Short mmCIF file of C-alpha atoms in Angstrom, two decimals:
data_model
loop_
_atom_site.label_atom_id
_atom_site.label_comp_id
_atom_site.label_asym_id
_atom_site.label_seq_id
_atom_site.Cartn_x
_atom_site.Cartn_y
_atom_site.Cartn_z
CA UNK A 1 0.00 0.00 0.00
CA UNK A 2 0.89 3.69 -0.24
CA UNK A 3 0.65 5.88 2.85
CA UNK A 4 -0.88 9.33 2.48
CA UNK A 5 -0.89 12.73 4.16
CA UNK A 6 -3.30 15.60 3.58
CA UNK A 7 -3.13 19.37 3.95
CA UNK A 8 -5.81 21.93 4.80
CA UNK A 9 -5.77 25.67 5.49
CA UNK A 10 -7.59 27.69 8.13
CA UNK A 11 -9.70 30.71 7.31
CA UNK A 12 -8.14 34.16 7.61
CA UNK A 13 -10.65 36.18 9.63
CA UNK A 14 -14.21 36.49 10.94
CA UNK A 15 -16.65 39.42 10.88
CA UNK A 16 -15.94 42.02 13.54
CA UNK A 17 -12.40 40.75 14.09
CA UNK A 18 -9.53 43.08 14.99
CA UNK A 19 -7.02 42.74 12.17
CA UNK A 20 -3.75 44.12 13.57
CA UNK A 21 -2.38 45.28 16.92
CA UNK A 22 -1.43 48.71 15.56
CA UNK A 23 -2.44 51.80 17.57
CA UNK A 24 -6.13 51.15 18.17
CA UNK A 25 -8.70 52.80 20.43
CA UNK A 26 -11.90 51.31 21.87
CA UNK A 27 -14.66 53.22 23.68
CA UNK A 28 -16.37 51.22 26.40
CA UNK A 29 -18.72 53.79 27.97
CA UNK A 30 -21.39 53.20 25.34
CA UNK A 31 -24.99 51.98 25.50
CA UNK A 32 -27.35 50.67 22.82
CA UNK A 33 -30.88 51.81 21.99
CA UNK A 34 -33.66 50.87 19.57
CA UNK A 35 -32.87 47.33 18.52
CA UNK A 36 -29.71 45.29 17.95
CA UNK A 37 -26.37 45.81 16.21
CA UNK A 38 -24.55 43.07 14.31
CA UNK A 39 -20.86 42.55 15.09
CA UNK A 40 -18.97 44.13 12.20
CA UNK A 41 -21.22 47.05 11.15
CA UNK A 42 -21.04 50.81 11.59
CA UNK A 43 -22.93 52.54 14.41
CA UNK A 44 -24.11 56.11 14.88
CA UNK A 45 -24.20 58.30 17.99
CA UNK A 46 -27.54 59.87 18.85
CA UNK A 47 -26.69 61.53 22.19
CA UNK A 48 -23.74 62.06 24.52
CA UNK A 49 -24.94 62.43 28.11
CA UNK A 50 -23.83 65.71 29.67
CA UNK A 51 -23.04 64.51 33.20
CA UNK A 52 -23.35 60.70 33.18
CA UNK A 53 -20.80 60.36 30.38
CA UNK A 54 -22.30 57.41 28.48
CA UNK A 55 -22.66 57.59 24.70
CA UNK A 56 -25.91 56.36 23.15
CA UNK A 57 -25.35 54.52 19.86
CA UNK A 58 -27.51 52.53 17.45
CA UNK A 59 -27.45 50.98 14.00
CA UNK A 60 -26.45 53.29 11.16
CA UNK A 61 -29.30 54.82 9.17
CA UNK A 62 -29.77 57.14 6.19
CA UNK A 63 -28.45 60.69 6.24
CA UNK A 64 -26.14 60.26 9.24
CA UNK A 65 -22.43 60.12 10.09
CA UNK A 66 -20.77 56.89 11.28
CA UNK A 67 -18.77 56.85 14.50
CA UNK A 68 -17.19 53.41 14.88
CA UNK A 69 -17.37 49.68 14.29
CA UNK A 70 -18.45 47.02 16.77
CA UNK A 71 -15.80 44.42 17.60
CA UNK A 72 -15.89 40.75 18.58
CA UNK A 73 -16.00 39.58 22.20
CA UNK A 74 -16.90 36.16 23.60
CA UNK A 75 -18.55 37.57 26.74
CA UNK A 76 -20.52 40.73 25.88
CA UNK A 77 -22.57 39.35 22.96
CA UNK A 78 -25.57 37.05 22.58
CA UNK A 79 -26.08 34.29 20.02
CA UNK A 80 -29.01 34.89 17.67
CA UNK A 81 -29.67 33.65 14.12
CA UNK A 82 -26.37 31.74 14.43
CA UNK A 83 -24.38 34.95 14.84
CA UNK A 84 -23.02 37.18 17.59
CA UNK A 85 -24.94 40.41 18.27
CA UNK A 86 -25.17 43.16 20.88
CA UNK A 87 -28.65 43.20 22.41
CA UNK A 88 -30.52 46.37 23.32
CA UNK A 89 -29.78 47.85 26.72
CA UNK A 90 -26.25 46.48 27.04
CA UNK A 91 -22.71 47.76 26.86
CA UNK A 92 -20.92 47.62 23.51
CA UNK A 93 -17.28 47.64 22.42
CA UNK A 94 -16.84 50.19 19.62
CA UNK A 95 -13.50 50.80 17.91
CA UNK A 96 -12.89 54.40 16.86
CA UNK A 97 -9.46 53.98 15.23
CA UNK A 98 -7.38 51.04 14.09
CA UNK A 99 -7.72 48.21 11.59
CA UNK A 100 -10.84 46.04 11.51
CA UNK A 101 -12.57 43.40 9.40
CA UNK A 102 -15.92 44.68 8.14
CA UNK A 103 -18.78 42.92 6.41
CA UNK A 104 -19.01 43.77 2.72
CA UNK A 105 -21.74 43.74 0.09
CA UNK A 106 -19.57 44.52 -2.96
CA UNK A 107 -18.14 42.20 -5.59
CA UNK A 108 -14.89 43.86 -6.77
CA UNK A 109 -11.65 44.10 -4.83
CA UNK A 110 -11.03 47.63 -3.50
CA UNK A 111 -8.03 49.85 -4.23
CA UNK A 112 -5.55 50.54 -1.44
CA UNK A 113 -5.78 54.06 -0.04
CA UNK A 114 -9.21 54.86 -1.50
CA UNK A 115 -12.14 56.17 0.52
CA UNK A 116 -14.76 53.72 1.77
CA UNK A 117 -18.50 54.28 1.27
CA UNK A 118 -21.13 52.57 3.41
CA UNK A 119 -24.66 51.41 2.69
CA UNK A 120 -27.72 52.61 4.64
CA UNK A 121 -27.47 49.61 7.00
CA UNK A 122 -23.79 49.95 7.94
CA UNK A 123 -22.24 47.35 5.60
CA UNK A 124 -19.50 48.38 3.19
CA UNK A 125 -20.51 48.73 -0.45
CA UNK A 126 -18.32 49.86 -3.33
CA UNK A 127 -20.90 52.44 -4.48
CA UNK A 128 -22.59 53.80 -1.37
CA UNK A 129 -24.54 56.90 -0.42
CA UNK A 130 -22.71 57.59 2.87
CA UNK A 131 -19.31 59.28 2.68
CA UNK A 132 -16.78 58.60 5.43
CA UNK A 133 -13.21 59.48 6.39
CA UNK A 134 -12.10 55.85 6.78
CA UNK A 135 -9.80 54.08 4.33
CA UNK A 136 -9.31 50.66 2.78
CA UNK A 137 -6.34 48.61 3.99
CA UNK A 138 -6.03 46.01 1.22
CA UNK A 139 -7.35 42.91 2.97
CA UNK A 140 -9.94 40.98 0.98
CA UNK A 141 -11.10 37.44 1.78
CA UNK A 142 -14.23 35.31 2.21
CA UNK A 143 -15.26 32.95 5.01
CA UNK A 144 -17.93 30.41 4.02
CA UNK A 145 -19.68 32.71 1.54
CA UNK A 146 -19.37 35.84 3.71
CA UNK A 147 -17.53 38.81 2.20
CA UNK A 148 -14.99 40.52 4.48
CA UNK A 149 -12.86 43.61 3.85
CA UNK A 150 -10.12 45.35 5.85
CA UNK A 151 -10.77 48.95 6.91
CA UNK A 152 -8.51 51.54 8.57
CA UNK A 153 -10.50 53.72 10.98
CA UNK A 154 -9.48 57.26 11.95
CA UNK A 155 -10.78 59.06 15.03
CA UNK A 156 -13.59 61.51 14.30
CA UNK B 1 -38.52 61.58 66.77
CA UNK B 2 -37.58 60.38 63.27
CA UNK B 3 -33.99 59.73 62.24
CA UNK B 4 -32.59 61.41 59.14
CA UNK B 5 -29.94 60.51 56.57
CA UNK B 6 -28.18 62.90 54.21
CA UNK B 7 -26.33 62.32 50.95
CA UNK B 8 -24.10 64.46 48.72
CA UNK B 9 -22.55 63.98 45.28
CA UNK B 10 -18.97 64.87 44.41
CA UNK B 11 -18.21 67.24 41.56
CA UNK B 12 -17.31 65.75 38.20
CA UNK B 13 -14.22 67.68 37.09
CA UNK B 14 -11.83 70.58 37.69
CA UNK B 15 -10.25 72.95 35.16
CA UNK B 16 -7.32 71.41 33.32
CA UNK B 17 -8.14 67.87 34.45
CA UNK B 18 -7.63 65.00 32.02
CA UNK B 19 -11.00 63.50 31.15
CA UNK B 20 -10.33 59.97 29.87
CA UNK B 21 -7.27 57.72 29.69
CA UNK B 22 -7.67 57.05 25.96
CA UNK B 23 -4.75 57.73 23.61
CA UNK B 24 -3.37 61.02 24.91
CA UNK B 25 -0.05 62.80 24.40
CA UNK B 26 1.77 65.26 26.67
CA UNK B 27 4.55 67.62 25.55
CA UNK B 28 6.78 68.46 28.50
CA UNK B 29 9.69 70.06 26.61
CA UNK B 30 7.95 73.45 26.46
CA UNK B 31 8.82 76.60 28.38
CA UNK B 32 6.69 79.62 29.24
CA UNK B 33 7.98 82.95 27.93
CA UNK B 34 6.78 86.47 28.79
CA UNK B 35 3.54 85.92 30.65
CA UNK B 36 1.45 83.56 32.76
CA UNK B 37 -0.80 80.66 31.77
CA UNK B 38 -3.93 79.49 33.56
CA UNK B 39 -4.49 75.74 33.65
CA UNK B 40 -7.26 74.79 31.25
CA UNK B 41 -6.48 77.50 28.69
CA UNK B 42 -5.01 77.32 25.21
CA UNK B 43 -1.41 78.28 24.43
CA UNK B 44 0.49 79.43 21.35
CA UNK B 45 3.99 78.53 20.16
CA UNK B 46 6.13 81.61 19.52
CA UNK B 47 9.42 80.05 18.40
CA UNK B 48 10.74 76.50 18.11
CA UNK B 49 14.48 76.25 18.74
CA UNK B 50 16.36 74.47 15.97
CA UNK B 51 19.10 72.75 18.02
CA UNK B 52 18.16 73.03 21.70
CA UNK B 53 14.69 71.56 21.11
CA UNK B 54 12.76 73.60 23.68
CA UNK B 55 9.58 75.27 22.44
CA UNK B 56 8.57 78.72 23.68
CA UNK B 57 4.86 78.94 24.53
CA UNK B 58 2.65 81.69 25.88
CA UNK B 59 -0.99 82.67 26.28
CA UNK B 60 -3.13 82.59 23.15
CA UNK B 61 -3.95 85.94 21.54
CA UNK B 62 -5.79 87.19 18.46
CA UNK B 63 -4.77 86.06 14.99
CA UNK B 64 -2.88 82.90 15.94
CA UNK B 65 -3.57 79.17 15.79
CA UNK B 66 -3.44 77.36 19.16
CA UNK B 67 -1.10 74.48 19.94
CA UNK B 68 -2.44 72.71 23.02
CA UNK B 69 -3.99 72.99 26.47
CA UNK B 70 -2.15 73.27 29.78
CA UNK B 71 -3.01 70.58 32.34
CA UNK B 72 -2.89 70.22 36.11
CA UNK B 73 0.09 69.16 38.20
CA UNK B 74 0.72 69.36 41.95
CA UNK B 75 4.50 69.75 41.53
CA UNK B 76 5.09 71.98 38.49
CA UNK B 77 2.49 74.71 38.99
CA UNK B 78 2.31 77.58 41.48
CA UNK B 79 -0.60 79.06 43.41
CA UNK B 80 -1.67 82.59 42.50
CA UNK B 81 -4.80 84.69 41.91
CA UNK B 82 -6.86 82.11 43.84
CA UNK B 83 -5.92 79.66 41.07
CA UNK B 84 -3.27 77.22 39.86
CA UNK B 85 -1.03 78.84 37.25
CA UNK B 86 2.23 78.26 35.40
CA UNK B 87 4.80 80.94 36.15
CA UNK B 88 7.07 82.50 33.55
CA UNK B 89 10.46 80.92 32.94
CA UNK B 90 9.49 77.38 33.91
CA UNK B 91 8.78 74.06 32.27
CA UNK B 92 5.14 73.54 31.32
CA UNK B 93 3.01 70.50 30.45
CA UNK B 94 0.97 70.97 27.26
CA UNK B 95 -1.50 68.26 26.25
CA UNK B 96 -1.61 67.93 22.47
CA UNK B 97 -4.03 65.04 21.85
CA UNK B 98 -6.75 63.45 23.93
CA UNK B 99 -9.75 64.54 26.01
CA UNK B 100 -9.44 67.51 28.37
CA UNK B 101 -11.69 69.68 30.52
CA UNK B 102 -11.49 73.34 29.51
CA UNK B 103 -12.77 76.62 30.89
CA UNK B 104 -15.66 78.04 28.89
CA UNK B 105 -17.58 81.30 28.54
CA UNK B 106 -20.72 79.95 26.83
CA UNK B 107 -24.23 79.31 28.14
CA UNK B 108 -25.67 76.66 25.78
CA UNK B 109 -24.61 73.02 25.75
CA UNK B 110 -22.57 72.16 22.63
CA UNK B 111 -23.43 69.50 20.07
CA UNK B 112 -21.28 66.38 19.88
CA UNK B 113 -18.75 66.39 17.05
CA UNK B 114 -19.01 70.09 16.18
CA UNK B 115 -16.10 72.46 15.64
CA UNK B 116 -14.50 74.33 18.55
CA UNK B 117 -14.27 78.12 18.56
CA UNK B 118 -11.94 79.90 20.98
CA UNK B 119 -11.94 83.45 22.33
CA UNK B 120 -9.08 85.93 22.24
CA UNK B 121 -7.98 85.18 25.81
CA UNK B 122 -7.72 81.44 25.11
CA UNK B 123 -11.01 80.11 26.51
CA UNK B 124 -13.81 78.26 24.74
CA UNK B 125 -16.70 80.33 23.39
CA UNK B 126 -19.78 79.66 21.26
CA UNK B 127 -18.97 82.67 19.04
CA UNK B 128 -15.21 82.78 18.64
CA UNK B 129 -12.97 84.60 16.17
CA UNK B 130 -10.37 81.78 16.07
CA UNK B 131 -10.82 78.64 13.97
CA UNK B 132 -9.73 75.32 15.45
CA UNK B 133 -9.51 71.69 14.35
CA UNK B 134 -10.45 70.33 17.79
CA UNK B 135 -13.88 68.88 18.54
CA UNK B 136 -16.35 68.54 21.39
CA UNK B 137 -16.82 65.39 23.46
CA UNK B 138 -20.20 66.13 25.09
CA UNK B 139 -19.07 66.71 28.67
CA UNK B 140 -20.75 69.81 30.08
CA UNK B 141 -20.76 70.50 33.83
CA UNK B 142 -20.10 73.26 36.37
CA UNK B 143 -18.04 73.45 39.57
CA UNK B 144 -19.11 76.30 41.88
CA UNK B 145 -19.83 78.95 39.24
CA UNK B 146 -17.12 77.79 36.81
CA UNK B 147 -18.18 76.50 33.39
CA UNK B 148 -16.29 73.50 32.00
CA UNK B 149 -16.48 71.68 28.68
CA UNK B 150 -14.91 68.48 27.34
CA UNK B 151 -12.70 69.01 24.29
CA UNK B 152 -11.13 66.39 22.01
CA UNK B 153 -7.68 67.53 20.88
CA UNK B 154 -6.12 66.20 17.67
CA UNK B 155 -2.39 66.35 17.00
CA UNK B 156 -1.39 69.48 15.10
CA UNK C 1 53.95 75.21 31.58
CA UNK C 2 50.23 75.30 32.41
CA UNK C 3 47.69 72.55 31.79
CA UNK C 4 44.64 72.80 29.55
CA UNK C 5 41.34 70.97 29.06
CA UNK C 6 39.02 70.92 26.06
CA UNK C 7 35.32 70.49 25.31
CA UNK C 8 33.43 69.07 22.33
CA UNK C 9 29.73 68.68 21.54
CA UNK C 10 28.14 65.62 19.95
CA UNK C 11 25.92 65.85 16.89
CA UNK C 12 22.18 66.02 17.47
CA UNK C 13 20.77 63.40 15.09
CA UNK C 14 21.40 61.00 12.21
CA UNK C 15 19.34 60.33 9.07
CA UNK C 16 16.39 58.01 9.62
CA UNK C 17 16.50 58.36 13.41
CA UNK C 18 13.41 58.52 15.61
CA UNK C 19 13.32 62.06 17.00
CA UNK C 20 11.74 61.25 20.37
CA UNK C 21 9.41 58.92 22.28
CA UNK C 22 6.11 60.53 21.27
CA UNK C 23 3.14 58.47 20.08
CA UNK C 24 4.60 56.66 17.05
CA UNK C 25 3.76 53.62 14.93
CA UNK C 26 5.90 51.41 12.67
CA UNK C 27 5.08 48.85 9.96
CA UNK C 28 7.26 45.76 9.64
CA UNK C 29 5.14 43.63 7.26
CA UNK C 30 6.43 45.53 4.23
CA UNK C 31 8.75 44.21 1.52
CA UNK C 32 10.97 46.20 -0.83
CA UNK C 33 10.15 45.58 -4.49
CA UNK C 34 12.26 46.23 -7.62
CA UNK C 35 15.01 48.45 -6.25
CA UNK C 36 16.66 49.76 -3.10
CA UNK C 37 15.56 52.33 -0.52
CA UNK C 38 17.79 54.88 1.20
CA UNK C 39 17.43 55.18 4.97
CA UNK C 40 15.80 58.52 5.71
CA UNK C 41 13.74 58.89 2.51
CA UNK C 42 10.04 58.51 1.79
CA UNK C 43 8.59 55.37 0.22
CA UNK C 44 5.46 54.53 -1.76
CA UNK C 45 3.23 51.45 -1.78
CA UNK C 46 2.65 49.89 -5.20
CA UNK C 47 0.44 46.95 -4.22
CA UNK C 48 -1.09 45.32 -1.14
CA UNK C 49 -1.74 41.58 -1.26
CA UNK C 50 -5.35 40.50 -0.86
CA UNK C 51 -4.96 37.37 1.27
CA UNK C 52 -1.27 37.16 2.18
CA UNK C 53 -1.18 40.57 3.87
CA UNK C 54 2.22 41.88 2.81
CA UNK C 55 2.75 45.32 1.28
CA UNK C 56 5.10 45.96 -1.64
CA UNK C 57 6.96 49.27 -1.28
CA UNK C 58 9.55 51.13 -3.33
CA UNK C 59 11.26 54.49 -3.67
CA UNK C 60 9.06 57.51 -4.31
CA UNK C 61 8.71 58.90 -7.83
CA UNK C 62 6.71 61.63 -9.56
CA UNK C 63 2.95 61.20 -9.79
CA UNK C 64 2.71 59.13 -6.60
CA UNK C 65 1.60 59.63 -3.00
CA UNK C 66 3.98 59.02 -0.07
CA UNK C 67 3.20 56.44 2.61
CA UNK C 68 5.99 56.54 5.19
CA UNK C 69 9.66 57.01 6.00
CA UNK C 70 12.30 54.33 6.53
CA UNK C 71 14.15 54.27 9.86
CA UNK C 72 17.50 53.07 11.17
CA UNK C 73 17.93 49.46 12.27
CA UNK C 74 21.34 47.91 12.91
CA UNK C 75 20.09 44.38 12.19
CA UNK C 76 17.91 44.54 9.05
CA UNK C 77 20.00 46.93 6.93
CA UNK C 78 23.01 46.66 4.63
CA UNK C 79 26.02 48.91 4.04
CA UNK C 80 26.41 50.35 0.54
CA UNK C 81 28.07 53.46 -0.94
CA UNK C 82 29.18 54.33 2.62
CA UNK C 83 25.56 54.50 3.83
CA UNK C 84 22.79 52.32 5.27
CA UNK C 85 20.07 50.98 2.97
CA UNK C 86 17.40 48.29 2.65
CA UNK C 87 18.23 45.88 -0.16
CA UNK C 88 15.67 44.55 -2.63
CA UNK C 89 13.44 41.65 -1.65
CA UNK C 90 13.62 42.09 2.12
CA UNK C 91 11.67 43.37 5.09
CA UNK C 92 11.67 47.08 5.92
CA UNK C 93 10.58 49.24 8.87
CA UNK C 94 8.29 52.06 7.73
CA UNK C 95 7.31 54.72 10.27
CA UNK C 96 3.70 55.68 9.59
CA UNK C 97 3.30 58.31 12.34
CA UNK C 98 5.52 60.31 14.69
CA UNK C 99 8.55 62.59 14.58
CA UNK C 100 11.53 61.60 12.44
CA UNK C 101 14.78 63.09 11.15
CA UNK C 102 15.02 62.88 7.37
CA UNK C 103 17.37 64.08 4.65
CA UNK C 104 16.77 67.49 3.11
CA UNK C 105 17.93 69.46 0.07
CA UNK C 106 16.84 72.96 1.12
CA UNK C 107 19.12 75.81 2.18
CA UNK C 108 17.19 77.75 4.85
CA UNK C 109 15.37 76.94 8.07
CA UNK C 110 11.71 75.92 7.68
CA UNK C 111 8.66 77.41 9.38
CA UNK C 112 7.17 75.49 12.30
CA UNK C 113 3.74 74.07 11.50
CA UNK C 114 4.06 74.49 7.73
CA UNK C 115 3.19 71.80 5.20
CA UNK C 116 5.93 69.54 3.84
CA UNK C 117 6.93 69.58 0.18
CA UNK C 118 8.89 66.64 -1.22
CA UNK C 119 11.06 66.13 -4.29
CA UNK C 120 10.65 63.45 -6.95
CA UNK C 121 13.42 61.37 -5.36
CA UNK C 122 11.76 61.30 -1.93
CA UNK C 123 13.83 63.82 0.04
CA UNK C 124 12.36 66.91 1.68
CA UNK C 125 12.91 70.16 -0.20
CA UNK C 126 11.22 73.55 -0.23
CA UNK C 127 9.18 74.59 -3.31
CA UNK C 128 8.97 70.93 -4.34
CA UNK C 129 6.38 69.35 -6.60
CA UNK C 130 4.78 66.59 -4.50
CA UNK C 131 2.31 67.73 -1.83
CA UNK C 132 1.89 65.81 1.44
CA UNK C 133 -0.02 66.21 4.70
CA UNK C 134 2.96 66.03 7.09
CA UNK C 135 4.36 69.03 8.95
CA UNK C 136 7.65 70.39 10.15
CA UNK C 137 8.41 69.75 13.83
CA UNK C 138 11.01 72.48 14.35
CA UNK C 139 14.39 70.85 13.83
CA UNK C 140 17.28 72.05 11.68
CA UNK C 141 20.81 70.69 12.02
CA UNK C 142 23.67 69.40 9.89
CA UNK C 143 25.78 66.33 10.55
CA UNK C 144 29.23 66.36 9.04
CA UNK C 145 27.81 67.86 5.82
CA UNK C 146 24.40 66.15 5.54
CA UNK C 147 21.28 68.30 5.93
CA UNK C 148 18.61 66.92 8.27
CA UNK C 149 15.11 68.11 9.15
CA UNK C 150 12.49 67.01 11.69
CA UNK C 151 9.09 65.96 10.34
CA UNK C 152 5.74 65.15 11.97
CA UNK C 153 4.01 62.31 10.10
CA UNK C 154 0.31 61.49 10.43
CA UNK C 155 -1.32 58.25 9.32
CA UNK C 156 -2.77 58.36 5.81
#
């Protein structure tokens, strides 16, 4: 007989994953209102409390300005529709600057250094209606028919 | 008789106090020249030495872009005018990036993410004649008839 | 006879040397492509790999946008034409933010806070063609005949 060995590769990333350990910033004094936010999508700020100091954020909508991207944690999320989400009325981890893996709806690889446009629901699309100050970072992969892209986030 | 219990709340912040421990930067190689600086007020850079490296700073005036905000210290400052000031001819801490409490002369709470306008004397004002690239953070409180506001400082 | 004693002063900086310990950031997952890079000169990114993650960099030319500045490293560099360089097909340290000493071609001191103009070969020079978003940090010295200048670099 002939003995055999096989080789397999792991995936590269998952939605909401922190790409690199390069000069990042996460805001933890945030609270969620009006529904749920998927891990890996932009969020908007509706109010910053004057004295309490907590920032009220929710899912990105039309005619607004994004503030940050939710990140992945094994303790703060809940499991719904076979995916990790931040439920209403709970603390959220929002990255304001760094490098992150974001969900994508496009079909063509982006160009390094170009501006990123979002859709009305917070997922990256090549031709969007929301203009941001974030940038592409060149990462482009796919995990079990889920499109992921790499985004560099600057502080607003 | 009926027993009684009393409760009091501490004040939130003091002028020149650092707000959050999130990605700040302090320049300590500066020196005050020809004047005094109140903690929690903007400063201007007059001349940057080519070889020595020390930077001459003073109080902000009309027709000049600010550099940073002086912060508190129990060892570097001196006590004068019922306040905590930086005397002339001494090393001074200037915070260049981060979140800082600043003295203000306004009466209406600012909107999160808007531009910051300074006055001639170096204090925040709703209607200022000096343009600035800093932003608001939402903090808005008062400590015994002193108005304070939370400012996000970006590196020059 | 009577005795004597002397005094000498060391130079301030060297090309491609980190100016100080401010908030900086380096990139070490870059590879030099088709040529060599001088230590202390700007570089440009030609391509970023989609799945592998490396970044191909080269010397700056006309009609391109700068990305960073190479820095000194006694281990990863090679000696050529009596200088320190990064040879082709190897790793390279690229400083993407912070204060750095870099080579210059100008003849007079620069103005603090002014924008940086670069030449087609990647060295700082007044009235140059390429426009960047970096600033001058107030440093002007010569080392045994080479002209150096201190630059503040922000992330793209």
